[PDB]
Ligand binder design. Structure first.
Ligand SMILES: C[C@H](C[C@@H](C[C@H](C[C@@H](C[C@@H](CCN1CCCC1=O)N1CCCC1=O)N1CCCC1=O)N1CCCC1=O)N1CCCC1=O)N1CCCC1=O
Ligand SMILES: COc1cc(CCNC(=O)c2[nH]c(-c3ccc(C(F)(F)F)cc3)nc(=O)c2O)ccn1
Ligand SMILES: [Mn+2]
Ligand SMILES: [Mn+2]
Length: 180
């Protein structure tokens, strides 16, 4: 199954980001060859998480996304057990040592409010931080604390819009938006 979407996502994203997305989808029983929109979304979320951890100081974050399930949970346990913070029900994306909390990164093709409320209804023990970026260039964070510098968030927003543009130039953006 040779799709324009798959070749585009391989030309658009870092080879390592691509490999991590592939491993994560296959672990979840999904096929990147034939479920290509989801492959692109997973790559995008990955790159945003990495970009985000690159903001701030150097020892600041611990990266949870992009690991295998078992080691990601091992790090989450080490975090909770050394810092005393409650253990979250679901695997988050990062941990901020500077503010001592987990961070849940979201990336949506819809309005950021709906995505935020969705991600908030499934974490009832609401001690973790939610930060949502949209494809159109806005964002929303818990208690209005956007964690990072303005320049770092701006780099992320520019990147998401460049992805969206380049997708739309190949007429793949419509199928991507109308797929979430
Ligand atoms: C550490 C390593 C990979 C990290 C993921 C991430 C990749 C990062 C690399 C950036 C910085 N740089 C620096 C050199 C050029 C470059 O691009 N970015 C962001 C954009 C594209 C990219 O490549 N980071 C952040 C810390 C350093 C690093 O490399 N990951 C993957 C999941 C867990 C983790 O910590 N690890 C650790 C073991 C497995 C693995 O792969
Ligand atoms: C959810 O199923 C999955 C899950 C995995 C590994 C664990 N996942 C996350 O931790 C995660 N996953 C997503 C996500 C997943 C799929 C889509 C899709 F495909 F619908 F566009 C969009 C967002 N967003 C996040 O913010 C986030 O933290 C691997 C594969 N599939
Ligand atoms: Mn995650
Ligand atoms: Mn996330």
């Amino acid at each position: 199954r040779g799709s324009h979407m798959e070749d585009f996502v391989r030309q658009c994203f870092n080879p390592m980001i691509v490999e991590l997305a592939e491993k994560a989808m296959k672990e979840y029983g999904e096929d990147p060859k034939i479920e290509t929109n989801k492959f692109a979304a997973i790559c995008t979320h990955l790159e945003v998480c990495f970009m985000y951890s690159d903001g701030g100081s150097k020892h600041r974050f611990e990266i949870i996304e992009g690991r295998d399930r078992i080691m990601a949970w091992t790090v989450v346990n080490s975090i909770c057990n050394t810092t005393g913070v409650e253990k979250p029900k679901f695997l988050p994306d990062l941990y901020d040592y500077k503010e001592n909390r987990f961070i849940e990164i979201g990336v949506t093709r819809r309005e950021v409010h709906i995505y935020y409320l969705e991600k908030a209804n499934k974490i009832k023990s609401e001690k973790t931080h939610i930060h949502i970026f949209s494809f159109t260039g806005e964002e929303m964070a818990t208690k209005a604390d956007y964690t990072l510098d303005e320049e770092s968030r701006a780099r992320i927003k520019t990147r998401l819009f460049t992805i969206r543009q380049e997708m739309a130039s190949r007429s793949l953006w419509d199928s991507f938006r109308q797929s979430e």
